Amino acid sequence: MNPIIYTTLIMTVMSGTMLVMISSHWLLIWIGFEMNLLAMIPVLMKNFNPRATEAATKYFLTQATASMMLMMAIIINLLYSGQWTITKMFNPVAMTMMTMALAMKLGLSPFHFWVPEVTQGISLQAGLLLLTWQKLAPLSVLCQISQSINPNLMLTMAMLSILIGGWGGLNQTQLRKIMAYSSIAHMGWMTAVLPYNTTMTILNLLIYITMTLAMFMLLIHSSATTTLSLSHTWNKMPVITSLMMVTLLSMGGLPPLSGFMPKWMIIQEMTKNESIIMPTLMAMTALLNLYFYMRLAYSSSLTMFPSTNNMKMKWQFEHTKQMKLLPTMIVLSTLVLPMTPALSSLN
Amino acid sequence: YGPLAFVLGERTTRKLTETSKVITVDGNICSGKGRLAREIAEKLGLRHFPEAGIHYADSTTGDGKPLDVQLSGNCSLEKFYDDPKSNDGNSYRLQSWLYASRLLQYADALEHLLSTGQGVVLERSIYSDFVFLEAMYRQGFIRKQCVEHYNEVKKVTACEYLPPHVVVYVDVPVPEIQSRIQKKGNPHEMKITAAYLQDIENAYKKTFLPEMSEKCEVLQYSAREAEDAEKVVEDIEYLKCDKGPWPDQDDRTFHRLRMLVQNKLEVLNYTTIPVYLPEITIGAHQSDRVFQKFTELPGRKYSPGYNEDVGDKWIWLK
């Protein structure tokens, strides 16, 4: 792919997301979603492999179904209200259909099945975009219609997402699949507080985006896609695997790391609304995510695995590609807990 | 060089000219291919890369001086000559290290060709390195699993590189090679058997040369024929350029290749595939100790230019 063409496709994805987050008309939100899908498919297939084609096809099918359901919901809302503005949806059936469509776009379980497959099929560069940038538009739409969202359906989807993400992450040895299941769990965490307080959803989204950017950029800097391949990184570059262990501990939600901020604030907001069983269950189920993160930390840094002889040649050379945002993303994802009262700026 | 340079207008097809070719002079052990390669490089004006050894990577990185065997290679050709069936896996470890060295060499050669435009004359290549491995397996020095690992590593790295435009092969026979070796002086080379050289020749003439002829032209010369550099040069100057997939290359694939060959760690990414063969699997304690020893070498601790011990200065503002 020509670099100019790749830049145009990336800018088209970003422009689709900005159209979704900027318009006041439902038709333009659907248009932005369509542009996002159109410009995302070739970005998924930048490196041509049968696995890449399979991932692109599955993603296209899922997003197409979700967009069709979303447009049907929009049309029904127009029929029962004569309105196109992004506001309190005036039909419960349309609200349910739109919720299902947006959950399918986000990958909330039981619409989670495509995420581990599409994430594994595509490269790390495309996986980062899929797991970070592709969550902005549906979350923004959900935040704009949080008033009309049926709390029961959203809470059930969030709890199922957390449970399924934790369970799926335990049986995975491919790093991309582990990241996909962690993303599913974190999306459930974000959508748990949508009916209660959207600013907490925004905070969780920002923290998750920083953590996933750090993790994916570390994986790219190590060129590792499996636990065994990542294990060798302790020999060539111990700093990368140590930072990866710290970021995994942060993702587990362990204080004083930044990953404690979203869970803590979410539990606070959900207890303010007299919901005590759901946040407790979510906190207890986060232990599975913490488990597979810890297992990875063992295989990567906490314990040293056997390397190969050819790493001696690799010792001499230094990395050429330089990701300028990696140190900032690592710092913001590990040492920002003393800065929670900054929550107000998101209001 | 990067995506920005390609966008701004720097295209490799402009740099390619009549003599922008990669030439690999192949041959059996001590076939005199080195002199032929040097003479080809001198007259055609191309750059000559001496065959990659154990310490080739040491030449490109750092002071250009070989490092210790414990640090750079952990293998010995002399030990392989003495004991080819050692239980230390020195044979296959040496073969894999030599394949990695030649992979780096090919990358440096392609880089030089795609950046400067000057042609390259290499001695053998990653495409010809499998001959030694097959000879070792036939002799029984290495087992089948080592061959499987070598094939797995090769099929992931060689595919991303263009085969040489010209394959010049010297065809000195086995008995003459034996005579040269027994007159060369090196006792370790004298320890080489006959079936090893015979299997090297068999592999060269059964798999490498036919497969290379399938892709591009394959010039062949005997001992007498290879001694006329003008004759060999004239053949290269009149070869049909249709041979090889290089005419099927545009600036897109050239940009991909130039991006790949400039990142050495990306070049050697799949060399250290996590296949736990006992012959190459270095233990955790030994890995830690050897890596610490490497890190304590002068200039090998920090990135190049930030090692104050080796005279690098202005580091505070650098």
């Binding site: 040895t173 636990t227 294990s231 | 736990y276 233990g283 304690h285």
Partner: peptide, 14 residues
């Protein structure tokens, strides 16, 4: 005496 430091048998579990 030394730390256990995973071997190939342990590493092949992952």
């Amino acid at each position: 005496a030394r730390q256990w430091q995973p071997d190939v048998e342990w590493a092949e579990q992952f």
